[PDB]
Symmetry: D2
Subunit: 234 residues, 4 copies
Amino acid sequence: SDDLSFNFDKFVPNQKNIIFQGDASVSTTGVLQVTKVSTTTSIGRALYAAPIQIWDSITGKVASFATSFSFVVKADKSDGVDGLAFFLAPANSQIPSGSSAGMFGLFSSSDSKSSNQIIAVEFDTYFGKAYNPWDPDFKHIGIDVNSIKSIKTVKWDWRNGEVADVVITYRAPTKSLTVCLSYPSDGTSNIITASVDLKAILPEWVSVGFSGGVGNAAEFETHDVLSWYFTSNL
Amino acid sequence: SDDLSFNFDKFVPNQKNIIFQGDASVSTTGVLQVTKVSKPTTTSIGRALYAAPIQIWDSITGKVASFATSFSFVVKADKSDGVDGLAFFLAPANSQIPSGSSAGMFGLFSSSDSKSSNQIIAVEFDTYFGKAYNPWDPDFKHIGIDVNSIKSIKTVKWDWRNGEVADVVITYRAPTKSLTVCLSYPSDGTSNIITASVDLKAILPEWVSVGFSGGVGNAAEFETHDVLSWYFTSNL
Amino acid sequence: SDDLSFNFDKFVPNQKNIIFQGDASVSTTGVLQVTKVSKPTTTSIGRALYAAPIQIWDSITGKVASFATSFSFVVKADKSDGVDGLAFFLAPANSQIPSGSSAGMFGLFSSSDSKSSNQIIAVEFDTYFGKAYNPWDPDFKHIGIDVNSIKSIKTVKWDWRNGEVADVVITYRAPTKSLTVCLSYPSDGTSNIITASVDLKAILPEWVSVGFSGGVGNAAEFETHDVLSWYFTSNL
Amino acid sequence: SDDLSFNFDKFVPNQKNIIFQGDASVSTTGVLQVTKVSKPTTTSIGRALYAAPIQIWDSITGKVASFATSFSFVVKADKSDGVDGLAFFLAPANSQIPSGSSAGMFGLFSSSDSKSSNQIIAVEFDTYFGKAYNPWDPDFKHIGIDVNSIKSIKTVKWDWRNGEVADVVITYRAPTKSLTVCLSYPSDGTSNIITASVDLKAILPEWVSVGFSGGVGNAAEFETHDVLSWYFTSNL
Ligand SMILES: CC(=O)N[C@@H]1[C@@H](O)[C@H](O)[C@@H](CO)O[C@H]1O
Ligand SMILES: CC(=O)N[C@@H]1[C@@H](O)[C@H](O)[C@@H](CO)O[C@H]1O
Ligand SMILES: CC(=O)N[C@@H]1[C@@H](O)[C@H](O)[C@@H](CO)O[C@H]1O
Ligand SMILES: *[C@@H]1O[C@H](CO)[C@@H](O)[C@H](O)[C@H]1NC(C)=O
Ligand SMILES: *[C@@H]1O[C@H](CO)[C@@H](O)[C@H](O)[C@H]1NC(C)=O
Ligand SMILES: *[C@@H]1O[C@H](CO)[C@@H](O)[C@H](O)[C@H]1NC(C)=O
Ligand SMILES: *[C@@H]1O[C@H](CO)[C@@H](O)[C@H](O)[C@H]1NC(C)=O
Ligand SMILES: [Ca+2]
Ligand SMILES: [Ca+2]
Ligand SMILES: [Ca+2]
Ligand SMILES: [Ca+2]
Ligand SMILES: [Mn+2]
Ligand SMILES: [Mn+2]
Ligand SMILES: [Mn+2]
Ligand SMILES: [Mn+2]
């Protein structure tokens, strides 16, 4: 059998196997609101309570993993900020000091420091050159490796209020990370793949989860994840 | 636990849990060659199904199954182009290759009509789109969702890479009747995706057989249709 | 992921992924009656196998598969006693019921000899031990590990409960060649257990079929042999 | 898919997904020594829990989880006998070792009373049954189902084999409130089994932590309490 495999068809208020950081919490309707819904600036992260071994220093083996989740980003106006992200970080990592919504509570700055040890898949809704000079000129899906400045991005045809199903696979033998996104409501689909060597970026033990932010209360939007499936294997 | 879940990291010559139809077989190197590779090359049609039928929906409870499958395949053409393509499909339990089928129909259809009695849902990786022989195809190599007809209900440009390995993930989420096809080439990062709505209960019978099919209609424009591995899960 | 994993929470009449041999069938209430239950009772023999063969060992790598299975069954006798029993088994791929088989051999054997050509490993839940007719059996109802012969290599007293549901877990751990049979009756806490060493590579071919078999040799001492659910996993 | 499923074929020193309490740790040879092993032996108590809490039941839907776990352990005594035993348990999420606990209570209890506030269900493999210090134990080494008390609700003779590896399978079937403990020694075929009815919803909180605990109350009668591997699955 595989090393780890967990599935959440729904979340429950004060779920003991999820570590809530910042404003992240789960509503009475069973959805994980990584960003606070009320109105105000917000940053939040939710991690699975147990660390995962992404690679072994003894055998040299690297883990292959696959995850699936459905999320909704509902903006009041036609646009919102800032985005949501799925990430892998050092075991029991805390939100960095001086982090901002535009960095999804994953980074202290816009530099590419190898000490960050973070790999994330962002669903970036804000790309304003005023605050995020590193972003391309459209809403996007990006593969982030130790920096908020994605190594590869793709146009994200975001649909306001609609549910998006995402499948992310990492195949160790080919160092391939593929992000599969689709909207069952209208058939809109976006995809992106990049090469990433986990052994080169992350430590042996990591924590997986979601993070997100709202930098401007005036351009509010939700960052709700409805369900989450995850498997890893060395 | 889920109803069914199988995984083949590699295939073995004369694998007893795979039903070989036509020219399909597995080489000594452990790959499933749905299409014959011989040199001297030749016209070919082949299909490989998992030996056990799967219940895709229940008439008693009304439930429909959700499924997910993953496979890696290679299509290596001698020249810069080849024919005809490969397909992943769901058909009536223990379905045989139709009479008078052709490579361009991947051994799944007797004709180009859209008959509801075909009871076939397939995801095609079409390499040949010549109007002279395949008038129903768009003007480029494509990935298509086929429902009871070789004339896809939805297609998308397929950025095929000669000889490179492609990883595919196909998911079917019953509650939303959503079929998503995720394709990527780890070698250069090329990715193609397509999704469509399909009600399995409306198209297929309760019991189906799943597998791969493919064809080579013109030996002069030969190409391989090899699947390297295969993972599959279904649940009611 | 594991090579194979299937689960049946219930069965459906004319289930396409189960091969029915003899009198085996599934009732409208969703239970697998390996033995016939009819108005005027009668002699019966039946077997039900999963439709797809399983690779229990590989001759290329030398690897042997570990497997685990779980099922719940009921044996309801009219009088206080019944015949003949039920068995879970592994046999050559797509094996048929042998000619001249009898209920006391659960449709698995042609005779009482220990022929290596039988290639059968089975776990029997033997209800009939009549010395004159089944001279090989011990003096009580039992659970037995059968290897190429109806004369078990190891048995244990089976505290059978008429009409009660029994939950069984059978595990085979390849690295230690250990086969463990875990049986329990949730209704009163009765539990029976037995383990034995068996080298699958030495007994069975690479490809096998798994399933249940059972029999009723004397219609006068009728009893049912119903399996309610079935879970199975194997991995090389 | 199931709610949770994890598997450890071996352990690694300072494993981040296991919470070590007391003297529990993992050696360089990859084994979980819940009890301390050292040149000069000593009194010891230790517990190891999976780092993430598990939802054993939901107060919203009323659903209760079914779970299954499998592990192999070794208890090697210097002399012919040893103390005190090992236990697999479910306790309140992130539970700590109680104050004034002793080896004979496996670091699970503060006393021998049956307090409902303990909220502990455990399966013990008790090696010490001395009436002077463990008056609640039967007159032999045993496997016991403990519910809120070190005085088991049901026990069974445990045919312990010094230094030999034991394979254990524990299943909890929610619909029948049945807890079955299956133990076997692949080396000689020795097998012990025990079943009991336990309503998890009545005993434990919604969120629990699972793991192993053990103790050595008298260094003079030292023995190891090593777990070699561990598989676990739960589902609501
Ligand atoms: C200090 C701060 O909050 N900066 C945020 C920035 O991270 C975000 O990208 C931007 C757009 O919403 O809004 C700003 O207020
Ligand atoms: C009857 C027949 O074989 N027709 C095939 C057709 O299926 C295929 O699309 C085409 C291109 O290879 O070649 C034709 O010969
Ligand atoms: C030839 C034949 O049918 N022999 C059966 C025997 O297999 C069974 O063990 C016994 C008890 O029911 O009844 C006999 O009639
Ligand atoms: C960025 O985060 C790291 C970790 O919290 C911290 O050490 C560093 O000082 C932060 N930068 C600033 C300006 O606080
Ligand atoms: C097409 O295939 C079906 C199934 O084998 C067959 O009945 C039919 O006669 C074939 N030919 C035509 C022209 O439909
Ligand atoms: C036993 O079964 C085998 C296989 O069907 C058969 O070859 C053999 O002749 C049978 N024995 C008898 C006495 O019929
Ligand atoms: C026994 O353990 C409980 C739980 O930690 C604790 O509250 C109690 O005070 C302990 N009893 C004694 C005498 O310390
Ligand atoms: Ca941004
Ligand atoms: Ca074509
Ligand atoms: Ca008998
Ligand atoms: Ca004791
Ligand atoms: Mn960005
Ligand atoms: Mn086409
Ligand atoms: Mn017998
Ligand atoms: Mn005890």
